[PDB]
């Protein structure tokens, strides 16, 4: 079993080094979403003083050419700090700066999704729109197969894994001990986590968050996640079917609500975003992952308690439809719903956009509006 | 010899993130007994604040369907808080919830025995039952070979390993002093434990617990012993015959004692009650395992220091019966007896239910009355 | 995987003494069947002279009180030479010689089934009843894992494997190989092989064999088959359910046919040997398998194109009844039926007895008629 | 680096075991493809007498349902022997017999192609069409990773192993120097080999063959290397792009000539063919591999010296078009041309039949006529 | 499991060599007895043509100082030739020569008890006394752990070994077979062959021998056995005890007749020399184990078969008794009797002189007699 080169170096040595008082200078991570909408991209730059917000630290710019956003000829690129997280890697007062991604001309980068999320949440800043997102993923060993399983082999049949205690039936717990202690420390509001079906794989919830936030928030733990993998020398894979057949595959739900659908009577308002989602299907399906469908289709085959991509479902408590309305929330006549389509390997940013664009502002078609 | 996969990530390093400050937020992991009988099921969520009593505790929802517990349909139940212990893994203020389970229809699950146990207990709480259990559990690898033993074959013979010291005598005490070092931090009742007759084999008492704190005792630690394994790559098994031929099977031992039996004489009750336990043994060896009877069988072979699979017998000071009258009790003519009779792998509640359903409330015949 | 000590010295050495010339001692390996009924033993002796039929081969004598087939006082048992068979494993002049067992009194052992079964073909002789039996078997590795599976793993579902090839769908071929070989060269009649939907389960046919040459040839080929997985140091296992679950078990199928019943118009004796099995079908699952109906029953669950252990099913074509009549046989109205009842670890001897009693010679009842 | 199980038993054992005179008996292995299209089975009997032709081989049965081809209820499926080789692993007597899969009707199964191929060449007999098709395939290890490949790499840049010698240039040389002697001991038509571009992918070319051999051959040329692999403890894959990106592909390429186009001025008959190419180009390219054209749509991209799997094009000496006619044959106005369009995992039958459907009978339309 | 490092070398070089013609010269391996009675010794001459006789081999010379036999100032010793065989190791025409050890001044040493028993038989040549020695031996790795067995610990409980067929029921078979082999190429009166009680405990059998020959035999077999084993990189032990506990330990049980035994009636003389055997009792257990009781005291516990050293138990059958008399013989009224006192380790001199010496020569007292 090939854990990596970079876990075997004896880390005893490198907490004898982090112990050392680093005295007044300050650490910055700046982190970024690369070219592809998937990757994470981070740098670290020395600042003399503690900033107090995040308009005080400054942009920054790297090289676009060797992350497949620019041409050679123009090939810088200019990061904006947007948000600002305690570091646990590096501890106080180190920080983790989430930033923005501009193109030489100071226009948006293709990927730079956020900036256009931010118009929508400031057009719809007043109803404060609540997300709350469950990121799956699968701990992988550097040789592609998944973590803790059978060299060159499977497990046992799905059923016993789910929830699981005991070292046959959790395989990595301790990432998911690192990862949550480093996102509570962070300041992340991450609320829960559970093992899922298949063996090595693990569902992190973050929320409820408002707005943009929830970009802010998920990619840093996205991050977090890959980072605390590095130390232990595993790989977190987003990829919405790791393992072909009938090996579950790893979703992103999605709960919404709104001011008027958590209030009294607002279980109208939840159905009235449903049925906007039911005439905007296919262009969500769309918005829901990077590729367009090429990756969402290998998970949603319509068993294994998810929906079939090209047909929409919706039910009380129906753990299987495209929409569940969780049964409290129906008892009570308030809450939120859950998208269940998301795959685990979407871009946060796209979902949030689209989810308010269809049930918030009523549009229709398959483009989005530009607004003035 | 085989350990698991995550016992080989650098501990370390886990120890590094669990020591940062974890803030306000608070951990709950949430652990219930899943549609086999014997397997525990956990999972985590964050919370704001610090309950002050466990009624102050939310309810909670899973996946019944990935449990063995419901169809497909209505696969949504419910865990409703029990029981608060400290969390000995994450240290306080984080908490250990034991629940029970509900249905989608707000009855109890068809493995909620807690439910009916704690009617029962209501009904005799002016009695203060007492019950001890001595929890019998074997240590295995991960290739299914009990741990320690030589690869493929078998140590000498039995009789040096019974409460042994020494690298030859006493495989995994590190696992022991863990568990034990454990349950006292969380605040189980736990009274002793020794090294049992087969090597790897190992012993837990606790108690005595009065009346449903027993089950709620037992379970989670339990559950906190399979954690323990867990970190150490090995897995604690509770069948009663783990290994074939003459090797030492599982038993869990019950002390049980009333107000009436521990006062100035009685020995007289527990003789009659003795009486009561002959004539319905069946009864007994029906509520004292999981799979009916047929676990159980492997084990009281009655050659090796056990009763044979069908006969009642009592007396003071014998290893080869189903219930013994500790000497001690017989001399001050109050006390204990010790039913010999239930397998490792028995549900509690079971057990104490049958155990006062007989002794207590007088009932007869084959099934359990049912009480306004 | 842990093959065996013996399979890793050197085998170029054993060549190396295995190409001098032997002169003329002839060396005899004496095979017989234990106490248990499946297990097979074996010692040689140095005979000075060549013999011309078996008639001239000594009788011989061993311990019983290690073979698990006799106690106190009188130990000594008997070895007389039934069966001659040219040595694979040596090459000629070199014989394996099958024995029947006799107690110190010179009547038939309790598990010297042969003698029995003589008596009944020498009465049935004129009519000539072929038999031949599919004998399915498990290759394991030492660690008592099947051979070839990721170690602590499963291979993939069942499906590419039956009659596979490639490195990925057959394991053990070699030894399928080598066991071929030496059953044609020993003079068996050995009629095909075949992998079987398990991974590293197979299935060798032996037949048609008239009367007890049938047991005569079936008991040495697993002799054999021992021998050859002794070389290679693997295990072969005739456990009809090797894996507990989805995996498929291991069945010995009985062809049987008459000289009636393959002349013109046979088919109506084959219905009638089917009406007399359908009146003795407990008799018959009682005489296939040792220890005693235990074994049987793990197979024979209705799943896996298997009949159910307690209800008699015919079925032309039907490979999933109790009870098959081949397609070429229905449609030429002559031939052989399969009785697909025997588990894997049957005595070959109670099967064909039983069958013939029942199918030839009109017996009814319980018990074992005797004869003069 | 994991080779299987099988490859690491003593071959040595084996090799004494096969040296054993086999005697009058002779083995006979039926091979047949399954439901999948792609894989091949195989099982052997044993046959008395040497048969002298293929019609005087007897019919056989086997279990469809354990190979995707059947129902449970008329599981049986027959074995026609169509096609004899001499059996390069066991040597002479031995025999190899490729055979056609009928229903339990005596109908063609869904993927015995030969049958429908058969017909159309004996439609087109005398012109004699000749074909050859070169049968590009990749060595893999067990673990799924190329064989030869560093562990979890990549070796060089493509250029130095097309044709390369020597310990970094040629992975697996042995492998295809034992199957070339073992096809040509066999009676294939083998004309050469030559290591592809990518390390351990190497290609073979049968051919000329005449009209259905040319599907007898190829079918047991890919057996004999999956017997070879096997040996050896490799996996033959003829995946069209085994491993993404930069990496060469696999293709078929198939050399077709008629009498005509053999014959002076044949070359006019060559475009005429091209010109019909031009016309069925859809249906051939859904014809030419077994899902329909989602196999070949992964290495047909138009890069690495490929056609575009959309657009067709022809040239003289053009390595890159759908249809290429080599130099010489346009120099000498006579000869074959290649089509280079089919997957390495095509079956030949298929590719066949759809070259002389479209080129010699003049066909038109997407579903093939129906010929009395 | 650590075998020698002789073994590891590659054996196929070896073979090289060894295929060499030899030319005309002959190789001689001289073979001796060493000081402690148990070890042999041997070294290699060459000769310049064949020795026809015994008589034309060449008297040769060692130092015993190196052998526990000489003191320094004196300790040249002789070897005479005494027996020739066939050399299995180096083949024809070389040869193997057992040898008779002198002083320096043509005494016997104290070891060579051959001249001696020599004297005596010639004494008695006329009765002619043959004798067969059963030989147990056990197979042990370089480590000192019995070979075969799991690392650190014992294999299953006595039972399935005996005579046993299987990977894990022998272990060493082809030390066994390549033995038995080399003894009947040499030209051993080998008898036959015997899996033990105990896994990697053998036996075999030499004889009947007559007289002095007896000991010549069993000698050069314990030097083959040697030899083999030093080809495949285990010792062959002869301890009496191999391993402490409940495993079977090691006998050379002694079969003795006479001519008059062998003739009508001879069961008289049986019955004479049995009783004379019984007025003779701890000479003879001072004399069947190199020192005495000693070791010979830690098999004859009487418990796993054996005979309490203490006291005689002539008995038909009675396997667990001093001097056995085959029930063959009782019945048969001719025979011999079986002395189940000699300890493996034996020097077969001293039992067969002191056999003669009670038997036959009708002597009395502890000290045997010197003749003219």
Not at 41 to 47: N, P, V
Request: one cysteine or more; charged letters at 25%; glycine letters at 10%.
């Amino acid at each position: 079993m090939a854990t990596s080169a970079s876990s075997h170096l004896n880390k005893g040595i490198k907490q004898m080094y982090m112990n050392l008082p680093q005295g007044e200078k300050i650490q910055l991570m700046y982190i970024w979403v690369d070219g592809t909408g998937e990757g994470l991209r981070c740098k670290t730059r020395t600042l003399d003083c503690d900033p107090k917000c995040v308009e005080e630290l400054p942009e920054w710019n790297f090289d676009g050419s060797s992350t497949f956003q620019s041409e050679g000829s123009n090939s810088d690129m200019y990061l904006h700090p947007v948000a600002m997280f305690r570091d646990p890697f590096r501890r106080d007062p180190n920080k983790l700066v989430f930033c923005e991604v501009f193109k030489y001309n100071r226009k948006p980068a293709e990927t730079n999704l956020r900036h256009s999320c931010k118009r929508i949440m400031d057009m719809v800043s007043s109803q404060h729109p609540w997300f709350g997102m469950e990121q799956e993923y699968t701990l992988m060993g550097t040789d592609g197969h998944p973590f803790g399983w059978p060299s060159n082999g499977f497990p046992g049949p799905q059923g016993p894994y789910y929830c699981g205690v005991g070292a046959d039936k959790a395989y990595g717990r301790d990432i998911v001990e690192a990862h949550y202690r480093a996102c509570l420390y962070a300041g992340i509001k991450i609320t829960g986590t559970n093992a899922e079906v298949m063996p090595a794989q693990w569902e992190f919830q973050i929320g409820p968050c408002e707005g943009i936030r929830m970009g802010d928030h998920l990619w840093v733990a996205r991050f977090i996640l890959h980072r605390v993998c590095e130390d232990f020398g595993v790989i977190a894979t987003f990829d919405p079917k790791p393992i072909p057949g009938n090996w579950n595959g790893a979703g992103c739900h999605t709960n919404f609500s709104t001011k008027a659908m958590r209030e009294e009577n607002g279980l109208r308002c939840i159905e009235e975003a449903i049925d906007k989602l039911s005439k905007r299907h296919q262009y969500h399906i769309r918005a829901y992952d990077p590729k367009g469908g090429l990756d969402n289709a290998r998970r949603l085959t319509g068993f294994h308690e998810t929906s079939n991509i090209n047909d929409f479902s919706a039910g009380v408590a129906n753990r299987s439809a495209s929409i569940r309305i969780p049964r409290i929330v129906g008892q009570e006549k308030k809450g939120y719903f859950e998208d269940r389509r998301p795959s685990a390997n979407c871009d946060p940013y796209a979902v949030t956009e689209a989810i308010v664009r269809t049930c918030l502002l009523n549009e229709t078609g398959d483009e989005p509006f530009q607004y003035k």
